[PDB]
Design a protein around this ligand. Structure first.
Ligand SMILES: Nc1ncnc2c1ncn2[C@@H]1O[C@H](CSCC[C@H](N)C(=O)O)[C@@H](O)[C@H]1O
Ligand SMILES: CN1Cc2cc(F)cc3c2N(CC3)C1=N
Length: 256
């Protein structure tokens, strides 16, 4: 399995954003999946009653797409990744660096799902002010943020991280409990990840992915102290040149 040092030495954040998050008129498997993720995260943070004071995002990578509907429903967003270089990319955007990744196609798509109430500029300034803390993170540790003081959060979010981060089910189920340590009892857990998948590519470079099915996922979340409110499985896959998944699951859970 890809080790944490392989993420520190070889995970290229600029390449990663270019292969997966360049929203494209040409209807790429990647654009479709991104459109799938974007309409689910709107559904969860805007239509459903998923709102709170504090949202922690775990495995943020170099991406801000998972936070664009979230910032409508939370006052404070803390973003985390195990890879510093990833957190360095994220911050470029937060600072509105003119060398930050261009997200606006995505910001336009979301500004649309939310019924054009706001322009691109002012949905971007909602997210920037919402993100209060950018922190090192590790889902294998029982205190994944280490020493860092944080109030109990109302929602933990993890997009396409825990498949990347966990060599096996025991580790996977351990990681779920550990994110619960950051959550108020009856606090929301949101996970969007790949189903039946062993790898994904960032350019020439190969990264493992925990190969796990519908049953295994939903079993681990119960084990970890959660009750599932909704669970969803789309059959849409990544390009065959990039990933070997059979689909993607989304879930909203609660902490017993
Ligand atoms: N043990 C670990 N703890 C925390 N993050 C980890 C980890 N192992 C890998 N990661 C991070 O998990 C991420 C997987 S890529 C996911 C990026 C983004 N959330 C998206 O949905 O596209 C990488 O940024 C990698 O650095
Ligand atoms: C963007 N993707 C693509 C992808 C496809 C896949 F099948 C499995 C995994 C990924 N990962 C994590 C695990 C990502 N971070």
């Amino acid at each position: 399995f890809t080790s944490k040092d392989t993420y520190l030495s070889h995970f290229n954040p600029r390449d990663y954003l270019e292969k997966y998050y360049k929203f494209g008129s040409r209807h790429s498997a990647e654009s479709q999946i991104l459109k799938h993720l974007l309409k689910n995260l709107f559904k969860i943070f805007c239509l459903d009653g998923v709102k709170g004071d504090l949202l922690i995002d775990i495995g943020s990578g170099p991406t801000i797409y998972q936070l664009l509907s979230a910032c409508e429903s939370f006052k404070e967003i803390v973003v985390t990744d195990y890879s510093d270089q990833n957190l360095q990319e994220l911050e470029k955007w937060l600072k509105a660096a003119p060398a930050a990744f261009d997200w606006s196609p995505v910001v336009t798509y979301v500004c649309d799902l939310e019924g054009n109430r706001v322009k691109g500029p002012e949905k971007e300034e909602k997210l920037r002010q919402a993100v209060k803390q950018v922190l090192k993170c590790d889902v294998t540790q029982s205190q994944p943020l280490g020493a860092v003081p944080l109030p109990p959060a109302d929602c933990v979010l993890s997009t396409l991280c825990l498949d990347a981060a966990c060599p096996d089910l025991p580790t996977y189920c351990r990681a779920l409990r550990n994110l619960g340590s950051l959550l108020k009892p009856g606090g929301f857990l949101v996970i969007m990840d790949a189903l039946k998948s062993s790898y994904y590519m960032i350019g020439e470079q190969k990264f493992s992915s925990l190969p796990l099915g519908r049953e295994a996922v939903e079993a681990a979340v119960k084990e970890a102290g959660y009750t599932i409110e909704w669970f969803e499985v789309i059959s849409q896959s990544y390009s065959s040149t990039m990933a070997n998944n059979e689909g993607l699951f989304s879930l909203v859970a609660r902490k017993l």
